[PDB]
């Protein structure tokens, strides 16, 4: 089962349709158990508001919201049973609340002396309160692009301003850290006409 789109951004009030290409539909909010939402293609489960509906047949099914509500933001998984006895889920579609474009605020943090005394340097790049979710973070050490030595994590959509935040950590040995001068993180986002670079010099 292939779900389209992977991520759906909708304003409160839009008609929204999630397609399952090849029906059962489950809703899941972050951290909670999946709940049966629309079973047998179009039957609404207990507690499901009337704005939800299901349609489709054969190789194409769809879940439809007449008027998007804020509480409808969640992951939606389609699930099928085949009788080779197999119970298969789809990759799920995230239905998020759309807001206005906000470019991230970029900050950089050099490693502390405490961590350097242990032989490791962690440089942290923060992208604060941006939307939409898509962005790109590139680590550059003396203009050399880093690869395979960073890890990032992203918060859930903020319940107040509907933005995302991203934290990226570049980890090096103290020796490799002292072998270079300029440490920078370069951020690209659709709200930016040109990439934003935040950098520092190791000695300063």
């Amino acid at each position: 089962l292939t779900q389209t789109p992977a991520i759906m951004s909708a304003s409160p009030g839009e008609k929204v349709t999630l397609t399952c290409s090849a029906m059962h539909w489950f809703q899941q909010k972050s951290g909670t158990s999946p709940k049966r939402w629309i079973y047998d293609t179009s039957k609404l489960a207990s507690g499901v508001p009337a704005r939800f509906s299901g349609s489709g047949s054969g190789t194409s099914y769809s879940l439809t919201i007449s008027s998007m509500e804020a509480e409808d933001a969640a992951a939606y998984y389609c699930q099928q049973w085949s009788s080779p006895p197999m119970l298969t889920f789809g990759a799920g579609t995230k239905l998020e609340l759309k807001r206005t474009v906000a470019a991230p605020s970029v900050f950089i943090f050099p490693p502390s002396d405490e961590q350097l005394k242990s032989g490791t340097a962690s440089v942290v790049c923060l992208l604060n309160n941006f939307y939409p979710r898509e962005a790109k973070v590139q680590w550059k050490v003396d203009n050399a692009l880093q690869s395979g030595n960073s890890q990032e994590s992203v918060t859930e959509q903020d319940s107040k301003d509907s933005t995302y935040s991203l934290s990226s950590t570049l980890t090096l040995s103290k020796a490799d850290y002292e072998k270079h001068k300029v440490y920078a993180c370069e951020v690209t986002h659709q709200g930016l006409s040109s990439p934003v670079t935040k950098s520092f010099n190791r000695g300063e």
């Binding site: 961590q115 950590t169 980890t171």
Partner: protein, 198 residues
Amino acid sequence: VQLQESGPGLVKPSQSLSLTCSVGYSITYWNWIRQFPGNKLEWMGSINYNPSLKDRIITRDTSKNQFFLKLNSVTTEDTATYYCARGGDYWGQGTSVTVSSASTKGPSVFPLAPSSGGTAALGCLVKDYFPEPVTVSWNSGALTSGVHTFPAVLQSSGLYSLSSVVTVPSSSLGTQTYICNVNHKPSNTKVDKRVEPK
């Protein structure tokens, strides 16, 4: 109908993962379904199996109205949240199972100091701990606005690392003290790390 999962949340690799589900309705399909960190759902099996796992995978006991999952020779890829369910209409709460060789270790808390508009960012890096979770507060709970505590990442060392940041007015960097309070119960470690500008 109510289903509840129980069992250990930490199993060593190549050992056995055993989970019990207590079931409001009789057992005469009842499924085990897991969700990976990547949020992919996978049906494992049912008792009244998925070919991807049939070689190492479910029993039942009617005296206490429980059915059980047995997964042998676990690897780190088996780290997941496990749910028991009746068909697809009633799901359990789910239990997180971490498959790791790591041992309990408290975290190191390093400062992310603010330096050179009117908004500054600072925080704390909580690095090299095991297992999940840690909790982070700011100024003993007095500072919550602008706080972002990120999900932990699993490093190649097998230890977790996360960051907790907060944005503040720049003019407050000389007048307001900022302390992050990190708590890691499995190691009984508690750190109050002061973040001073550079």
